[PDB]
């Protein structure tokens, strides 16, 4: 399933990141890193959801998760 993160999407991300030239080995590594980054956030988010006795995750769960994980996102508070 994770392979749905497309090669040209990763390229566009690298381009917003100012990268000129790209080893193919990047794509799988990036998918691995992304998966870990997602997992850590999601675990805490689900933890807020579960603490709240919800079955539904909120954007606030993501906010609190990201804030405690040191990456405070404005635009969803």
């Amino acid at each position: 399933n994770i392979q749905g993160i497309t090669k040209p999407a990763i390229r566009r991300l690298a381009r917003r990141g100012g990268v000129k030239r790209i080893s193919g080995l990047i794509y799988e590594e990036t998918r691995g890193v992304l998966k870990v980054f997602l997992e850590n956030v999601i675990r805490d988010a689900v933890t807020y959801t579960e603490h709240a006795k919800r079955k539904t995750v909120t954007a606030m769960d993501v906010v609190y998760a990201l804030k405690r994980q040191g990456r405070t996102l404005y635009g969803f508070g």
Binding site: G4, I5, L25, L38, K55, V57, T58
Partner: protein, 96 residues
Amino acid sequence: PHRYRPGTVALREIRRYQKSTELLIRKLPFQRLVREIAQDFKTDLRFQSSAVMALQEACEAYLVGLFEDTNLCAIHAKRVTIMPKDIQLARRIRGE
């Protein structure tokens, strides 16, 4: 027939995607991934649509900044080409 040189369109692409703010990953499969990840922390979960969007913004932002570090690692290594070791170095220096 006409051609650009290698890298010229890549510099054009940097200008494009740095001038723009649009999210870069396909919405649907990003959500698909999030759901299967979440299934391992708890079964039968559901999401606010906004939470998906917020996650995508966060993930793409995290990746972009990390790629700038990666770019700088390659540049410090006299490469213009990024390699997995650049990411590993950056993540290690970030203390991940």
